[PDB]
């Protein structure tokens, strides 16, 4: 078989395939992407609220300068379905679910890791600059473990996939 543009071979074994799992293009795609990786059953409400809660409950770490916004404002703001999640949400969600979250950054051709040295299990979400999707192996596995050999083959696959997607113009970016 010949792979689709959203797919990438993993390792030389030839059995395994990494692929984009596209999520709804609304304003909460970051949450769809994480929810798919971890719960495989869409949640956005629960995810937004846990971020907002953690923010309220620790104004010292998440102080106004860190947040670029008054602690109380951001807690309210991130509860709105039109508010775009980003690094701050990822960090909190990662902590709270004891799973690392790796952003496969298409425009940068880099992988930005969150909590990779606290948690050995991780998911991959695919960031095209304005949108998030999820990444699966063989369309059934979404949680990987950085201590297994498969893991490097997977990360290598993610990078090539990112590279292919950037080349074919699915990148966009904003800064």
């Amino acid at each position: 078989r010949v792979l689709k543009s959203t797919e990438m071979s993993i390792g030389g074994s030839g059995e395994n395939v990494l692929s984009v799992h596209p999520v709804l293009d609304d304003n909460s795609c970051l949450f769809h992407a994480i929810a798919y990786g971890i719960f495989k059953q869409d949640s956005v409400r629960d995810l937004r609220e846990m971020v907002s809660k953690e923010v309220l409950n620790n104004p010292v770490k998440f102080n106004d300068a860190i947040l670029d916004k008054p602690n109380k404002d951001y807690a309210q703001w991130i509860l709105k379905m039109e508010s775009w999640g980003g690094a701050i949400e990822i960090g909190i969600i990662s902590d709270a679910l004891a799973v690392a979250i790796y952003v496969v950054d298409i425009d940068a051709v880099k992988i930005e890791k969150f909590n990779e040295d606290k948690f050995d299990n991780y998911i991959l979400i695919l960031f095209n600059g304005i949108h998030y999707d999820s990444l699966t192996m063989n369309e059934f596995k979404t949680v990987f473990n950085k201590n297994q050999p498969e893991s490097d083959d997977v990360l290598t696959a993610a990078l090539q996939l990112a590279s292919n997607l950037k080349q074919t113009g699915y990148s966009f970016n904003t800064h």
Binding site: L30, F62, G86, K110, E112, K118, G129, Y132
Partner: protein, 75 residues
């Protein structure tokens, strides 16, 4: 000179800089060590949002000063 950068994900990281290094240089140094694009980086020292153009001496950042790094990545 040696300064520290702490992330919201509990990571502490040691840079080697100079008072005349710009925040940009520091951001590049962070890219080189952590693989994060500078355009996705916000740096904070002493409740200030540091600007790409100013230098480290401008913010009195010196030996064993700790910087805070927050990413963007909004989608």
């Amino acid at each position: 000179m040696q300064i520290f950068v702490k992330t919201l994900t509990g990571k502490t990281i040691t840079l080697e800089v100079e008072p005349s290094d710009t925040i940009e240089n520091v951001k590049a140094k962070i890219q080189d060590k952590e693989g994060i694009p500078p355009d996705q980086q916000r740096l904070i020292f002493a409740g200030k949002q540091l600007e790409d153009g100013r230098t480290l001496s401008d913010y009195n950042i010196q030996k064993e000063s700790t910087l805070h790094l927050v990413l963007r990545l909004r989608g």
